[PDB]
Amino acid sequence: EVIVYTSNTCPHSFTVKEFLSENNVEFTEKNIQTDAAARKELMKKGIMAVPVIQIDEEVVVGFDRDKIEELLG
């Protein structure tokens, strides 16, 4: 149920990708430098930041590890 909006330009997208993988967390990666639909929806709700973590309804802006570990439990 985890959706991660990433981009190859900056490292916090990889920082959060490693964290999720190292805790056996499944997620759908939507890279906005090749995905136009993900880039479009991210622009729809006006989020000017990367990476975006959508945990089932809630959004985490940036690799806030303390918030991610809470939302996932």
Q: Residue 20 in contact with residue 55, Cβ under 8 Å?
A: no
Which two three-digit tokens encode residue 9? 């330009």
Least separation in angstroms between residue 36's CB and a second copy is 7
Sign of CA dihedral 5, 8, 9, 12: positive
37 touches a second copy by CB under 8 A:
no
Q: Is 49 in the site for a second copy (CB under 8 A)?
A: yes
Asked if 47 is part of the footprint of a second copy (rule: CB under 8 A), the reply reads yes
> Do residues 26 and 3 touch, judged by C-beta distance below 8 A?
no
Distance in Å, CB of 35 to a second copy, minimum: 9
Pick one of 14, 37, 70, 73: the residue that binds a second copy (CB under 8 A): 14
Torsion of Cα atoms, 24 then 2 then 7 then 66, to 10°: -70
Residues at the interface with a second copy (CB under 8 A):
1-20, 22-23, 25-34, 36, 38, 40-44, 46-56, 61-66, 69
